[PDB]
Design a protein around this ligand. Structure first.
Ligand code: HEM
Length: 404
């Protein structure tokens, strides 16, 4: 019961539910075989850990703090001075410093730009031959959004996406046995990223702008002292890496689920206003993650029958927690008219996702346009699923915009 767990077993990133259900039903918390980290699977236990001050997100309360003083020494300052490397206090400070630039009203100004990119991708490979929603559509949206936000030209767009992808899989190199890319190039992508990032920051420092996120941050460091070089460059790099693949897999999953559910798609056609809720149910019904989010214990305790090593890692199994029958009625149903307030897709507590509104705005316009301009769009072949350490990645998704 509390036994097996094959989060990399082929056919899991396509349908991990039938398997992860059983762990859930039986054991409210097991101990992943090779993992040396427990694995919570139930909703109310998963949630409580989030807003729980007894747990931590960092390594200075791990089994080894000197485990990240090794392997990829280049992201050192990003793990120590980044959003997951700041002790609780320091983290509250940087968040309130940055949160306001992420409110839905603040990012709203990025609509025309995003639509703009959304049309170029569409109207540049339509009436061609075939269309891959990942490679020809999603992959090209998220970096353009963040670039517009930091006010970087569309030329740096390719460079930065390669940087965030690399970084996301690399920072997860201590939490999971395998990876999708190789340490050689991956390391080049990170170094080359920090490189550009340092040029971008020197120029903004030189030519500051009004009502601007980098400008603002550059002051709060060299002014009043609420932010520091380290915590800053870390901050920007985290943001890119944290909101690159995630948004890609939201957009992709959504199209897939609107193709896998004509009921659902016939409702978002009748009342577009559902699209915002639909996209939230997409993460609820079928989460982009593989295992979840990670918390390290600070001091021994026995959460639901389990004494844990002061420093021992714990995974919050987010795909299953969102399939919890006691919280969501008919939980194995993709229902666009459902109440999704309880979703934990974007987390809970002090580290709740600051990119939530941006992510919704991007997919709202990504998913809304393509369907509206290609309503008869149907799937082509079965969708392929890679082996990313952090989440169920979908490498391919081809469809026919208008059959015949
Ligand atoms: C579909 C899109 C996205 C999803 C599903 C997602 C998911 C999440 C989740 C679950 C967390 C919290 C993990 C924890 O428990 O500690 C998180 C945190 C975070 N997210 Fe997002 N995210 C998305 C988009 C974005 C975007 C677009 C950005 C930035 C532009 C972003 C930036 C961040 C950052 C910087 C954190 C660190 C929080 C902290 O400790 O300060 N995310 N995201």
């Amino acid at each position: 019961p509390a036994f097996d767990f094959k989060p990399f077993a082929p056919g899991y990133a396509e349908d991990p539910f039938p398997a992860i259900e059983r762990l859930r039903e039986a054991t409210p918390i097991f101990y992943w075989d090779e993992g040396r980290s427990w694995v919570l699977t139930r909703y109310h236990d998963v949630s409580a850990v989030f807003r729980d001050e007894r747990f931590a997100v960092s390594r200075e309360e791990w089994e080894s703090s000197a485990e990240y003083s090794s392997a990829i020494p280049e992201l050192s300052d990003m793990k120590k001075y980044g959003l997951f490397g700041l002790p609780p206090e320091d983290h509250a400070r940087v968040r309130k410093l940055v949160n306001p630039s992420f409110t839905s009203r603040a990012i709203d100004l990025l609509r025309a730009e995003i639509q703009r990119t959304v049309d170029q991708l569409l109207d540049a490979r339509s009436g061609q031959e075939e269309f891959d929603v990942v490679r020809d559509y999603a992959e090209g949206i998220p970096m353009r959004a963040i670039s517009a936000l930091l006010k970087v030209p569309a030329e740096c767009d390719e460079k930065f996406r390669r940087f965030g992808s690399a970084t996301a899989r690399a920072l997860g190199v201590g939490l999971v046995p395998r990876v999708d890319e190789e340490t050689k190039t991956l390391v080049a992508s990170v170094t080359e990223g920090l490189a550009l990032l340092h040029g971008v920051l020197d120029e903004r420092r030189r030519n500051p702008l009004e009502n601007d996120v980098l400008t603002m941050l550059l002051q709060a460091e060299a002014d009043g002292s609420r932010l520091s070089t380290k915590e800053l460059v870390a901050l920007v790099g985290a943001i890119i890496a944290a909101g690159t693949d995630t948004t890609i897999y939201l957009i992709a999953f959504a199209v897939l689920n609107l193709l896998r559910s004509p009921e659902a798609l016939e409702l978002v056609k009748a009342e577009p206003g559902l699209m915002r809720n639909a996209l939230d149910e997409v993460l609820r019904f079928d989460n982009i993650l593989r295992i979840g989010t990670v918390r390290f214990a600070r001091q021994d305790l026995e959460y639901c029958g389990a004494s844990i090593k002061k420093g021992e890692m714990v995974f919050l199994l987010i795909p299953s927690a969102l399939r919890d029958g006691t919280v969501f009625s008919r939980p194995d149903v993709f229902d666009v008219r459902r109440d999704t307030s309880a979703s934990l897709a974007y987390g809970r507590g002090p580290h709740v996702c600051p990119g939530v509104s941006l992510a919704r705005l991007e997919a709202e316009i990504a998913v809304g346009t393509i369907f509206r301009r290609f309503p008869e769009m149907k799937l082509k072949e079965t969708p392929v699923f890679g082996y990313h350490p952090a989440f169920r990645n979908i490498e391919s998704l081809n469809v026919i915009l208008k059959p015949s």
